[PDB]
Design a protein around this ligand. Structure first.
Ligand SMILES: Cn1cc(C(=O)NCC2(N)CCCCC2)ccc1=O
Length: 103
């Protein structure tokens, strides 16, 4: 669980980050056209928080894959110069920068 002790740190930092607003809650496909069709496996921070609190993550590698899935989805659905896309890149860089510090 010394792997998952840093996960709580990095998730709450991503939760409180300025550019996290597109990823705090799951996308509502009733509100975003095409999202159901485009994104097969949606992911967001609150779903990751949910899962981490019940301890569903067995290793820190599973936690990183959920993080990378938030940004892979973001880059698949949103243009790089979109508001959501621009935020996704800041969040993605922040996650990689922060993850590379514990490992
Ligand atoms: C992860 N992600 C988030 C969004 C997003 O949040 N757009 C703004 C919104 N919060 C307010 C007005 C429309 C509904 C949602 C869009 C595409 C995406 O891939």
């Amino acid at each position: 669980h010394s792997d998952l002790t840093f996960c709580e740190i990095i998730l709450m930092e991503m939760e409180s980050h300025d550019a996290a607003w597109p990823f705090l809650e799951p996308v509502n496909p009733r509100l975003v056209s095409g999202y159901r069709r485009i994104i097969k496996n949606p992911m967001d921070f609150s779903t990751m928080r949910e899962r981490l609190l019940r301890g569903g993550y067995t290793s820190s590698e599973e936690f990183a894959a959920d993080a990378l899935l938030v940004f892979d989805n973001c880059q698949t659905f949103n243009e790089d110069d979109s508001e959501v896309g621009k935020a996704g890149h800041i969040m993605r860089r922040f996650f990689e920068s922060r993850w590379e510090e514990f490992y």
